[PDB]
């Protein structure tokens, strides 16, 4: 019922391989709509979903300006943080930056997000209130000082609780016939002998959306994790998602096991048995 | 859209 908009930035230094690469993606929920790459030919903020193409060239200008600028400042933060932790000119390092907002079915603002990582670790982040910065390490407090007195958190709260939610609602209302759809998972089972006395019962949930889903095995009515394998949710490459869960069971006892599927696009949770 | 916030660390 709820919805979310999230932007992800990544910048990687490649000393000797060239000048730092910058990649930026924007998702509404589990649906990407925009992308940008520094190694890209067009070097333009491109569309990735049909329902966002309906924006005047000023959109595609403003966003492009912003992403280019952010790429440059990221280029700065690279050498900056390379100075902080005293890192060689040689080493390759990564800056990741995630931010965005959440809304209910009501469209009401629910929560804001801004986190910043260096080399894959939390470097700094913004709390719920969108007022106070939290720094993970020593050198991060320096940055926090630079942003505490620059009223940066104010700019962030002004953007997130305002413009972000606005454009989120707009995107939702626009793409409604794709963004507010709920593809129910087509489910089925497979069954393969493993030993002379055992078999695998694999429970399949395909072609669903959104990715959020729950698959569980039950022995005679009580859950099992013993002898079970659960794979991470994966994209089909069409906008839908796939997932499965398998359990190794004794031969002839497949009737005792029950697979359970839960997903928003389902009125009532399914129960599959072999 | 995106943000205009640009500030070094």
């Amino acid at each position: 019922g709820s919805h979310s908009m999230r932007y992800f930035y990544t910048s990687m230094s490649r000393p000797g391989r060239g000048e730092p690469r910058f990649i930026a993606v924007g998702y509404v929920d589990d649906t990407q709509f925009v992308r940008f790459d520094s190694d890209a030919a067009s070097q333009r903020m491109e569309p990735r979903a049909p329902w966002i193409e309906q924006e005047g060239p000023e959109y595609w200008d403003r966003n492009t300006r912003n992403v280019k600028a952010q790429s440059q400042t990221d280029r700065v933060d690279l050498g900056t943080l390379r100075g902080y932790y005293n890192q060689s000119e040689a080493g390759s390092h990564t800056i990741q930056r995630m931010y965005g907002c959440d809304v209910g079915p009501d469209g009401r603002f629910l929560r804001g997000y801004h986190q910043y990582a260096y080399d894959g670790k939390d470097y700094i982040a913004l709390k719920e209130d969108l007022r106070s910065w939290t720094a993970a390490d020593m050198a991060a407090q320096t940055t926090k000082h630079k942003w505490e007195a620059a009223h940066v958190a104010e700019q962030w709260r002004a953007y997130l609780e305002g413009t972000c939610v606005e454009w989120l609602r707009r995107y939702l209302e626009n793409g409604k016939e794709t963004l507010q759809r709920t593809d129910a998972p087509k489910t089925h089972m497979t069954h393969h002998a493993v030993s002379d006395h055992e078999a695998t019962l694999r429970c399949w949930a395909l072609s669903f959306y959104p990715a959020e889903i729950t698959l569980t095995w039950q022995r005679d009515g009580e859950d099992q994790t013993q002898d079970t394998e659960l794979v991470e949710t994966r994209p089909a490459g069409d906008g839908t998602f796939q997932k499965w869960v398998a359990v190794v069971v004794p031969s002839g006892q497949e009737q005792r096991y029950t697979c359970h599927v839960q997903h928003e696009g389902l009125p009532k949770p399914l129960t599959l048995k072999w | 859209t995106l943000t205009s916030c640009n500030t070094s660390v």
Partner: protein, 99 residues
């Protein structure tokens, strides 16, 4: 930090021999972002191979989907080869249509 990629080779739809389909290699949970992903048909690299745009989950680890349109057959063996700094030797995962 360095997390190794998790790899999944699968098809967009259950494997029906002689029908148009998509072969997918999904790599995720890795860091850093310098990764190479190739698709092999009976051992040989596949040319026209596209990938999704780079992105990362809440735990900061990256994920990517490399895909190519193909038509499965009885004899044709497909695989995904992953080249990442966490791997001394590039990891080669055969496609298993049952999974």
């Amino acid at each position: 930090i360095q997390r190794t990629p998790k790899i999944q080779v699968y098809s967009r739809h259950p494997a029906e021999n002689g029908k148009s389909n998509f072969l997918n290699c999904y790599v995720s949970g890795f860091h850093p972002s310098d990764i190479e992903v190739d698709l092999l048909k009976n051992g040989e690299r596949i040319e026209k191979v596209e990938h999704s745009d780079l992105s990362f989950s809440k735990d900061w680890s990256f994920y990517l989907l490399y895909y190519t349109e193909f038509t499965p057959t009885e004899k044709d063996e497909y695989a995904c080869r992953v080249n990442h700094v966490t791997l001394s030797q590039p990891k080669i995962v055969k496609w298993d249509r049952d999974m």
